[PDB]
Design a protein around this ligand. Structure first.
Ligand SMILES: CCN(CC1CC1)C(=O)c1cccc(CC(=O)N2CCC[C@H](C(N)=O)C2)c1
Ligand SMILES: [Zn+2]
Length: 139
């Protein structure tokens, strides 16, 4: 679990979104596993606007942060789950690291701010849904 709070927005994994998230829906993209809902309180997270390929992520299944090198956002095959059939997930970045299902929502950060959130795992890889292209989160 986990979310990003920026301005009047809350960014979560689409497969973990709550009834409140869907009742205050701003935008969702099933191909990216993202959903953004509106909030009443102002969020203070800063979104990175960059092309970094190194950062640190929080891994809840180890209660630890790990430094990683990660790929550029791209269309990657992700196996079927109870939330989606087997499909191309877009804007996904992979790194070598530990990720179990409950790790979804952990934040990946670089020196510029929030880069994305854990969205996939397995096979000794961790995949992060990028949010750096969502320029509208800042206004
Ligand atoms: C090979 C079976 N296996 C390990 C099971 C745990 C024994 C996995 O598939 C597996 C392993 C670690 C993490 C995850 C989570 C994951 O990647 N998802 C599930 C939620 C939706 C995600 C998405 N963005 O489409 C995809 C799965
Ligand atoms: Zn950066």
């Amino acid at each position: 679990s986990g979310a990003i709070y920026v301005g009047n927005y809350r960014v979560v994994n689409r497969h973990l979104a709550t009834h409140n998230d869907w009742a205050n829906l701003v935008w969702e993209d099933s191909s990216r596993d993202l959903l953004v809902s509106s909030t009443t309180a102002q969020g203070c997270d800063t979104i990175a606007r960059c092309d970094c390929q190194t950062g640190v992520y929080y891994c809840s299944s180890r209660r630890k942060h790990y430094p990683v090198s990660f790929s550029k956002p791209s269309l990657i095959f992700v196996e079927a789950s109870e939330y989606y059939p087997a499909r191309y997930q877009s804007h996904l970045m992979l790194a070598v690291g530990h990720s179990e299902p409950g790790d979804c929502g952990g934040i990946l950060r670089c020196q510029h701010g929030v880069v994305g959130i854990v969205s996939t795992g397995g096979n000794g890889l961790v995949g992060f849904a990028d949010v750096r292209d969502l320029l509208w989160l800042d206004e």
